From Swiss-Prot, chains A, B:
Organism placement in taxonomy: Eukaryota, Metazoa, Chordata, Craniata, Vertebrata
Keyword Signal: no
Domain notes per entry: Forms a beta-barrel structure that accommodates hydrophobic ligands in its interior.
Summary of the function given for this chain in its UniProt record: Intracellular transport of retinol.
Highest taxon, organism lineage: Eukaryota
Residue numbers binding all-trans-retinol: K40, K108
Family the entry assigns: Belongs to the calycin superfamily. Fatty-acid binding protein (FABP) family.
Gene3D superfamilies from the UniProt entry: 2.40.128.20
Any one biological process term the GO annotation gives: vitamin A metabolic process
Annotated organism of origin: Homo sapiens (Human)
Subcellular location: Cytoplasm
Tissue: Higher expression in adult small intestine and to a much lesser extent in fetal kidney.
Annotated protein name in UniProt: Retinol-binding protein 2
InterPro entries: Calycin, Fatty_acid-bd, ILBP, Lipocln_cytosolic_FA-bd_dom
Length: 133, 133
């Protein structure tokens, strides 16, 4: 078939590094690129093609109900089991992940059109700010 | 407020390295992660949350008509101009990218539920396989 329409998810990628080196793509970029999954969206109508390639490293999906403890396997992060509980403290959503790691959890809250997330583990704190699309 | 619904685009990310290290995420993995932009999709109904964070690197878009030569600027790849021409050889879609690099182009074809993409540049060949979602 000549019909290449569809949404296509990468299954394998052989010698992407060699090809990128031939193009002179910088080292930093290649090191990232080889690790990414790619998704390809092809819109084909007769002889007209629109091709969109997107690259992704890892996803993280978590579902929870506030006030309901749950077993959480942090797959594709550090791969541990923790007992997670998310509760409200004012308008701050607060998560504690009980497990091997001390002081593990997070805080997530809104101010104006921005979302603030503070991730904690051990004595380390990571602070992230998101803007609404 | 407590409504955190929406699609959220990361604006900044402080000490992500510190946090991943405390989690014992491996060095190479940390170095890729710190570079990527994240998008957070939150679906909230009352106290029920579904959270999906996606880490992404680059995108590449190209539109063309089979048989019509066009100037391709490879923005976000090697940032060069090639005169690209895409043609059919049987059921294989074949592009030649004429410019500075020799043997530059690609081939795309369907076999079953799979899409095959061979990318070439200089003495290098990259082979990719995609499955329809
Ligand atoms: C017909 C479909 C084509 C030619 C798809 C081409 C996609 C690439 C040549 C991949 C480009 C990327 C890199 C070279 C590194 C950054 C990540 C990508 C996937 C955008």
């Amino acid at each position: 078939t000549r019909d290449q329409n569809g949404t296509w998810e990468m299954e394998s990628n052989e010698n992407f590094e060699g090809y990128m080196k031939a193009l002179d793509i910088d080292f930093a970029t290649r090191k990232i690129a080889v690790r990414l999954t790619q998704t390809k969206v092809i819109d084909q109508d007769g002889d007209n093609f629109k091709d969109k390639t997107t690259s992704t490293f890892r996803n993280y999906d978590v579902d929870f109900t506030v006030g309901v403890e749950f077993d959480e396997y942090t797959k594709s992060l550090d791969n541990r089991h923790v007992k997670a509980l998310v509760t409200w403290e004012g308008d701050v959503l607060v998560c504690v992940q009980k497990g091997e790691k001390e002081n593990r959890g997070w805080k997530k809250w809104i101010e104006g059109d921005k979302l603030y997330l503070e991730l904690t583990c051990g004595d380390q704190v990571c602070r992230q700010v998101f803007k609404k699309k």
